[PDB]
């Protein structure tokens, strides 16, 4: 879809990531694994909750009998109720479709933004494979991996080390 | 062959299907169905107050005191009234009732 | 022998949901009647099988 990440450059999902909607996978000599990015996940959830709520709140708002001399009145009544019915059914079905579209794209965008964050952080200290993975030009241990994840990664620290390896 | 980090998204065994403008029958990891299709199939008391069952009496029949309708002679509070489409026991002595429908809209209040 | 806050000719509704397709004519406090056979919000994201 729109942001080109989900079913995008990142080709599939992770059945392996159970803690979140979006996250990381890493491998190094210390080990390998899936990690959810709990912030982005929860925030997206809050957004979706707001969305569906607002759909409920905005939507949240007897018969009669008539004689046989009352044919036009009766029909006027029917046409009215039926009219409002048609209008509300339309509004609902439509609102649901459109918001669905928006929702999927919202998720896509979230992924894209996460990826972007990591990329723009890591710079040329890594190779960017284009599958959603970055291969490091320097040794990245669990502290460094967490630093990437928690947004703190140190470029100048691994800079020239990465440089030499990227070159040779 | 160096150390590696990846970004990705959740997947599960979900069979859940939704439609969009661009696309129909899309599967999603999570969904909420907001339309309620089911009911208990019973006629019930409403806020702990029972409805008035007319049985085979018409509204008119009950208000007039049609003999068959004698079981409705005294009644408590009602949440709503239940009338058959064609009640047997209307006015026994035949005749008419003027402004009948208006009177029903009145009974509804 | 029953209790509801919402009533239709077909039966009674107890639900947390915004809409019902069950019947037009309803007494009590009730979800919005619609003509729809289904209304489903996507919340999670697309399920894309892996490799």
């Amino acid at each position: 879809g729109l942001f080109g990440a989900i079913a995008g450059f990142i080709e599939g999902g992770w059945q392996g990531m159970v803690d979140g909607w979006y996250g990381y996978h890493h491998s190094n000599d210390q080990g390998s694994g899936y990690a959810a990015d709990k912030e982005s996940t929860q925030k997206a959830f809050d957004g979706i909750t707001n969305k569906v709520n607002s759909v409920i709140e905005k939507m949240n708002t007897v018969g009669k009998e008539f004689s046989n001399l009352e044919r036009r009145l009766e029909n006027l009544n029917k046409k009215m109720e039926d009219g409002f019915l048609d209008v509300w059914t339309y509004n609902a079905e439509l609102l649901v479709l459109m918001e669905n579209e928006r929702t999927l794209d919202f998720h896509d965008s979230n992924v894209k933004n996460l990826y972007d964050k990591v990329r723009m952080q890591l710079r040329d200290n890594v190779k960017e494979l284009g599958n959603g993975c970055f291969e490091f030009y320097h040794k990245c241990d669990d502290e460094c991996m967490n630093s990437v994840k928690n947004g703190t990664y140190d470029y100048p620290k691994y800079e020239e080390e990465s440089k030499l390896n990227r070159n040779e | 062959p160096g150390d590696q980090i990846c970004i990705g998204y959740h997947a599960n065994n979900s069979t859940e299907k939704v439609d969009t403008i661009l696309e129909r029958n899309v599967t999603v990891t999570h969904a909420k169905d907001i339309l309620e299709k089911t009911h208990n199939g019973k006629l019930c008391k409403l806020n702990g107050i029972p409805p008035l069952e007319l049985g085979d009496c018409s509204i008119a029949g009950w208000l007039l005191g049609n003999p068959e309708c004698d079981r409705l002679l005294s009644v408590p509070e009602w949440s709503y009234i239940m009338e058959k489409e064609n009640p047997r026991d209307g006015l026994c002595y035949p005749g008419s009732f003027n402004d009948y429908e208006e009177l029903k809209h009145l009974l509804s209040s | 022998n029953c209790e509801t806050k919402c009533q239709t000719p077909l039966g009674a509704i107890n639900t947390t949901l915004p809409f019902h397709n069950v019947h037009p004519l309803t007494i009590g406090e009730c979800p919005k009647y619609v003509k729809s056979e289904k209304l489903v919000l996507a919340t999670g994201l697309r399920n894309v099988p892996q490799i």
Partner: antibody
């Protein structure tokens, strides 16, 4: 909104039994990860266990303090999570909450019930 | 299983001041800590999740920090109604343990 309410607390002979009910109300997007947490008065909070949503298989986990005695189950019909406590002991005396995450993923317990207290003595 | 050590168990301070509770994990729970307030005679209320991340509709004066084992929780501008119990909880692995508790008392 959600508003969990719990019920059924009382006094029991040890060896005895009790069944606690936490009912759920309100529109929500998730039933999953319904947890029982108790607080003996003056003491800290202690986590008893949880039961999961239908879709997740109704699976259940327990603290090894109460494991094998207590059982968590849910009747969706009445929309309640029951904690069925058997072979009650003296240290089981505490106040009891059901608590819930709001999300799909259990990062924290967002929704609490109001508590109900059970005592155990001879 | 997993042990959560919260200190100080009791702390006194006065209005407007800044107070810091610590929580310590026997394992590394990564970033799966959460922080709760308990007003007296009430159920707990969620304050922080994912250790450093404010729950919806919470005052900005409440903060949280840390990773792995060491964790911190801070009330920046102290307030009248803030003097109550606080608990950490580890949601990293079952059983989801709690800290000992922290009682906040107002200086007099």
């Amino acid at each position: 909104e959600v508003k969990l309410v719990e019920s059924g607390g009382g006094l029991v002979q040890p060896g005895g039994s009790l069944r606690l009910s936490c009912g759920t109300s309100g529109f929500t997007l998730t039933d999953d990860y319904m947890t029982w947490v108790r607080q003996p008065p003056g003491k800290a909070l202690e986590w008893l266990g949880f039961i999961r949503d239908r879709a997740n298989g109704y699976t259940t986990e327990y603290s090894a303090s109460v494991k094998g005695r207590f059982t968590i189950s849910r009747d969706n019909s009445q929309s309640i999570v029951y904690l069925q406590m058997n072979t009650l002991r003296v240290e089981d005396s505490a106040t009891y909450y059901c608590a819930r995450p709001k999300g799909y993923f259990p990062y924290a317990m967002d929704y609490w019930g109001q508590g109900t207290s059970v005592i155990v003595s001879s | 299983d997993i042990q959560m050590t919260q200190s100080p168990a009791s702390q006194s301070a006065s209005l407007g001041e800044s107070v810091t509770i610590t929580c310590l994990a026997s394992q590394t729970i990564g970033t799966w800590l959460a922080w709760y307030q308990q007003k007296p005679g009430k159920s707990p209320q969620l304050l922080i999740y994912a250790a450093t991340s404010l729950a919806d509709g919470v005052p900005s004066r409440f903060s949280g920090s840390g990773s792995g084992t060491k964790f911190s929780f801070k009330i920046s501008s102290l307030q009248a109604e803030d003097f109550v119990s606080y608990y950490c909880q580890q949601l990293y692995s079952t059983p989801w343990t709690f800290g000992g508790g922290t009682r906040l008392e107002i200086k007099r």
